[PDB]
Amino acid sequence: KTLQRNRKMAMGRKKFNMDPKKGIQFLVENELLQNTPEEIARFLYKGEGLNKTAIGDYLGEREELNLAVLHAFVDLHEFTDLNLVQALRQFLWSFRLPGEAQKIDRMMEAFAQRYCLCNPGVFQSTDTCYVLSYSVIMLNTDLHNPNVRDKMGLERFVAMNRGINEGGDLPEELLRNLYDSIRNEPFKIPEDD
Amino acid sequence: MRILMVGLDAAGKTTILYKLKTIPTIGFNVETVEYKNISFTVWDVGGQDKIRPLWRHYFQNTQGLIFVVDSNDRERVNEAREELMRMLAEDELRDAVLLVFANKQDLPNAMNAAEITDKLGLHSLRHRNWYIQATCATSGDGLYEGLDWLSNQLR
Ligand SMILES: Nc1nc2c(ncn2[C@@H]2O[C@H](COP(=O)(O)OP(=O)(O)O)[C@@H](O)[C@H]2O)c(=O)[nH]1
Ligand SMILES: C[C@H]1CCC/C=C/[C@@H]2C[C@H](O)C[C@H]2[C@H](O)/C=C/C(=O)O1
Ligand SMILES: [Mg+2]
Numbered sequence: 001k002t003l004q005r006n007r008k009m010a011m012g013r014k015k016f017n018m019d020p021k022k023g024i025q026f027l028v029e030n031e032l033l034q035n036t037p038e039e040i041a042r043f044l045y046k047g048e049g050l051n052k053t054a055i056g057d058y059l060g061e062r063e064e065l066n067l068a069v070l071h072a073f074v075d076l077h078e079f080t081d082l083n084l085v086q087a088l089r090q091f092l093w094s095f096r097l098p099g100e101a102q103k104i105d106r107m108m109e110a111f112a113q114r115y116c117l118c119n120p121g122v123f124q125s126t127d128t129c130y131v132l133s134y135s136v137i138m139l140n141t142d143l144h145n146p147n148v149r150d151k152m153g154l155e156r157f158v159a160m161n162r163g164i165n166e167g168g169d170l171p172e173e174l175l176r177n178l179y180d181s182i183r184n185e186p187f188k189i190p191e192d193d
Numbered sequence: 194m195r196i197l198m199v200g201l202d203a204a205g206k207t208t209i210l211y212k213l214k215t216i217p218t219i220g221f222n223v224e225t226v227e228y229k230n231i232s233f234t235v236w237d238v239g240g241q242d243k244i245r246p247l248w249r250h251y252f253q254n255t256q257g258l259i260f261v262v263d264s265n266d267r268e269r270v271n272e273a274r275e276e277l278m279r280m281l282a283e284d285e286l287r288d289a290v291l292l293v294f295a296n297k298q299d300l301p302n303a304m305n306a307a308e309i310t311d312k313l314g315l316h317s318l319r320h321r322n323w324y325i326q327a328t329c330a331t332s333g334d335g336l337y338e339g340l341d342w343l344s345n346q347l348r
Contacts, residue, residue, distance in 0.1 A: 092219060099222030102239030109241075127243060134244045141220030148223060149194075149232070160247050187219035 008032060013049040020058035037068035044069070045076045045094060052190045055095040060103035067106070074110045079118040084129070085181045087115055088136060093190050097137070108133040124166055131164045136178060144186040154179050194225070195254055196343070197236045199280055200261030201273050205296040206235050208330040209261065229344060233259075238276055245283075252285035257343055261294045261330075262313065264303040270312045277313055281321065290346045291323040292339050299329040322346055 008030050016023025024040060027033035033043055044055050059070045077094070079087040091111050097104060112130035116123055123129040135157070142152050152160075158175045200206050206224070213228045225234040258280060262273045277293075280286060295309040306327045310316060315323055324346075326339030 097219050099220070100239055101221060101237040104221065105240035105244060131244055131247065134240070135247050137220050138247060141218060141223060145218040145220060145223050146216060147225050149225075156250060160250060163246065189217045189219065 005032070010049070013047070016058075017049075017051040017054050020054050024058075037065065038072045041069045041072035041076060045073060046193075048193055050192065052094075052192055053096040056098050059095060060098045060100070060107065062102075062106075070107065070110050071113075074114045077114060079115050082119070083177065084115065084133060085136060085178050087111075087118075088133065089187065092187050096190055097187075104137055105134065108137065128165050128170075132161060132170070132178075135161055135164075136182060139179065139182050140187050143183055194232045194234045194251070196231060196233045196257040196259060197252075197255050198233060198259040198261060199236050199238055199276065200294075201263065201266075201269055201276065202239070203266075204261040204263045204273070205294070205328075205330040206261050209294065209296075209328075209336060210235065212330065212333050212336055228340070231344075231347070238280070245279075248283070249285055252283055255286060255289060256347055257290045257292065258286060259292045259294060259339075259343070260313075261296050262309060263297050264295045264305075264309055265297045265300040267304065270304070270309075274313045281318070290343060291318070291321055292343045293323065293325040294328045294330070294335070294339060295325055296328045296330050298327045298335070299332065 009032055012023055012027040012030065012032060014023070015026045024033070027043070028035040033039060044050060044058070047055075058066060059073060060066075073094070074091070077091055079090070082090070088111070097107065109130045112126050112133055115133070116126045116129050123132075138160075139152065139157055142148050154176060157179045158172055161175055162169055164170065198206050198209070210224050210226055210233070213226045213233060221237060223234070225232060227233075260277045260280070262270070266273075281289075281291070293309070293313065293315065295304075295306045297303050298305075304312070306325050310325055315325060324339065324342050326335050326342070328335035328339065330336065
């Protein structure tokens with residue numbers, strides 16, 4: 001009964017990698033996973049044998065179930081005492097960020113709410129955190145995607161974020177620290193497990 | 194970047210770029226090409242309004258806007274209109290030349306260019322240099338005729 005349950009588990013993970021929905025459907029129907037956003041997100045978070053691009057694809061769907069999983073998945077992360085980039089490096093190792101702006105957007109906003117909860121007082125509103133987070137994803141693409149011909153200098157990056165702080169500016173040193181981090185170390189491409 | 198290409202998901206932007214035409218990077222799926230010595234980049238409009246302010250400096254060198262619409266998609270034509278108008282409202286694109294590709298004209302029941310013109314509100318754009326071109330992006334029909342018009346408007 002143990003070798004058998006392990007075989008069903010392995011098959012669920014394979015089916016997840018092919019079609020996230022369908023693999024979750026297999027796990028739930030076969031009684032190996034509770035069908036709640038919280039339990040699904042816990043299954044994904046650092047899950048052995050799960051393709052991180054599948055995880056990202058599943059988290060980026062617009063269906064309400066998936067948005068609830070996304071929030072519970074974000075909720076598993078521990079971002080206290082990290083600067084924004086350090087926290088994003090952790091979040092973005094847990095899954096492969098999709099390439100579509102709609103999805104990146106929703107994921108940055110979700111990441112933002114938890115960042116601010118872990119680090120109260122670092123930012124004045126969650127929107128400031130969310131827009132800055134999105135600008136970091138833009139900066140990583142700008143700097144490190146070779147199809148982008150001309151790259152932002154520091155100065156472009158600081159200027160891009162003028163006014164995001166409820167009309168006002170963030171301190172230049174905070175932006176420079178984020179810029180220099182990304183410039184000298186791109187977000188790593190995640191590896192499974 | 195000197196020409197930007199915008200349109201709802203499924204309009205045919207990626208298809209058109211493969212007519213005009215790799216290492217892993219975390220981030221946006223950048224699609225860009227040089228065509229006839231001019232950079233063309235797909236600009237993904239898929240986020241919330243809140244992150245549009247970040248865009249601004251990128252449009253400083255932008256001289257033309259291609260808007261691609263699925264002419265067979267009657268249910269989303271108004272949403273396409275709203276997006277076109279959002280783009281035309283960007284300060285940095287005030288003088289941008291507009292080319293509309295009325296795409297998927299191969300489909301039996303697609304709206305024709307005249308109808309697309311009405312529905313995207315082109316006739317209200319009185320101070321803008323614009324053109325609409327009927328296209329089939331899969332076969333290539335109409336694409337180069339539209340790009341040739343746009344080329345010539347840029348000088
Ligand atoms: N029938 C038809 N299909 C098209 C045309 N242009 C693109 N497609 C198809 O429409 C779908 C979406 O096209 P794609 O280029 O991915 O759209 P995008 O989201 O704007 O980049 C694909 O399945 C294309 O092959 C067209 O002119 N006629
Ligand atoms: C010149 C480069 C800079 C890369 C960072 C810019 C990202 C844009 C953010 C916009 O919401 C979607 C992306 C938009 O689609 C940008 C495509 C692109 O090639 O932009
Ligand atoms: Mg595309």
